[PDB]
């Protein structure tokens, strides 16, 4: 008598509600004779999935009509799938400055996977920088200190991609990672093991505590060629362009006076520029100092072939196959985080599924700008928010994928059951 998702799916809204209110007649008539395991199995293994799709939560059949009987009489708009169910999700890594309060309490709790992973990297994070990620991620106050904070965001990251794989079988289909989320993007896709990325994300991050207040960074609403542009003309260069999130959007990195400046006299003119809290200005020469030492201590991590399609954000091609030894995390901090050509990239190899296995979303418009440049329909996903309540884990994120069309593995979440005699709507 436990709630369970049942899925429903049609043609058009207005199909999906005639669909909705044929099911709770049914259901209505049958809820004698039918088990909600069968009929949820059914619904998710037996039929489909039409574009345009929805799930209602129920713990027993009566409260499945009740729900289904509140899409029929509703008036909502139902948005149609963007993917086809033959790609997997594109998972998105973002960098630091998701952290939140807590963050990890209630996945440790509501999701043995989460949990696990967050076990096999409490002793490596311990050996490496000193702290119990499990104490940070479960703290009363928000982690700070890039020493704890980005080993703290890594182990979020991974747990929720491991949660996603064996509890609910979401493969990713690609993984694009955007600067310091390239970390669990290697994991994710095999080209470093779960420990030797825990090490890479904790000996960086120990490194840069000597940098801590160099510098700060900057979003503004500009193309990165204008950008440019501007920084030339001005002659400005303790300021670079840092990062490439969008074609209209663009992060600068640099002094702290001269960003602040920046974003002040961009606000002037009316274009949408903001302050990025960070005290280390990433991907610009206010990082150059630690860059030997970060050699020296990745040059014993052992990269591997990426088993899924990584779209690197710090190589000039994004298609092509990182090489994830210490050559390329001293790059991957140093170098612009081409990230909208990476997204951009997997868009244009069919990818239209796209999830930010984050703490709190810091790229989802990011991937939609690009999607509208390449005139498409994507859907950008966040894995989780900032003091959102998860009380059945992340069973919300798997109902948002599958309405977007991501391809997933049904048995992982409706292992066994009969097929029933559920209707068959014709047309749509």
């Known amino acids: 008598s436990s709630p369970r998702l049942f899925m429903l799916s049609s043609t058009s809204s207005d199909a999906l509600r005639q669909t909705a209110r044929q099911l709770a007649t049914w259901v209505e008539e049958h809820q004698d004779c039918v088990a909600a395991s069968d009929l949820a199995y059914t619904l998710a293994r037996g039929r489909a999935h039409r574009p345009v799709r929805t799930a209602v939560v ?75 990620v499990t104490e ?9 200190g890039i020493d704890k904070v980005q080993p703290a965001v890594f182990a979020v990251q991974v747990a929720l991609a491991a949660t996603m794989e064996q509890t609910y079988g979401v493969r990713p289909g690609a993984v694009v990672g955007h600067s310091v989320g390239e970390s669990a993007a290697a994991v994710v896709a095999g080209a470093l093991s779960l420990e030797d990325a825990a090490r890479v994300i904790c000996r960086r991050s120990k490194l840069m505590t000597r940098i801590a207040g160099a510098g700060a960074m900057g979003s503004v609403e500009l193309p990165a060629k204008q950008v440019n542009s501007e920084l030339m003309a001005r002659g400005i260069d303790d300021v670079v362009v840092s990062v490439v999130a969008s074609p209209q959007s663009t992060v600068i990195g640099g002094t702290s006076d001269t960003v602040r400046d920046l974003i002040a006299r961009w606000e002037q003119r009316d274009v949408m520029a903001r302050e990025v809290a960070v005290d280390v200005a990433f991907h610009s020469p206010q990082v150059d100092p630690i860059l030997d030492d970060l050699a020296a201590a990745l040059a014993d991590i052992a990269p591997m072939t990426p088993k899924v399609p990584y779209y690197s954000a710090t190589l000039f091609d994004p298609r092509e196959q990182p090489v994830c030894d210490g050559a390329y995390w001293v790059d991957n901090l140093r170098n612009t985080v081409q990230f909208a050509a990476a997204v951009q990239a997997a868009m244009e190899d069919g990818y239209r599924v796209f999830a930010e296995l984050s703490p709190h979303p810091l790229l989802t418009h990011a991937v939609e700008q690009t999607g509208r440049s390449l005139d498409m329909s994507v859907a950008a996903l966040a894995g989780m ?42 047309w749509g």
């Open 58 to 132: 129920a713990a027993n059949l009566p409260e499945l009509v009740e729900g289904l009987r509140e899409v029929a009489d509703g008036d909502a708009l139902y948005d149609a799938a963007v993917g086809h169910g033959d790609r997997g999700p594109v998972w998105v890594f973002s960098g630091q400055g998701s952290q939140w309060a807590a963050m990890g309490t209630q996945l440790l709790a509501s999701e043995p996977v989460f949990a696990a992973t967050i076990a096999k990297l409490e002793p490596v994070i311990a050996a490496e920088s000193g702290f119990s």
């Open 136 to 144: 940070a991620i479960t703290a009363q106050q928000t982690v700070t």
């Open 385 to 426: 928010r900032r003091e959102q309540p998860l009380p059945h884990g992340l069973r919300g994120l798997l109902t948002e994928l599958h309405r977007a069309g991501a391809a997933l593995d049904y048995s992982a979440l409706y292992p066994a059951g009969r097929l029933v005699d559920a209707p068959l709507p014709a």
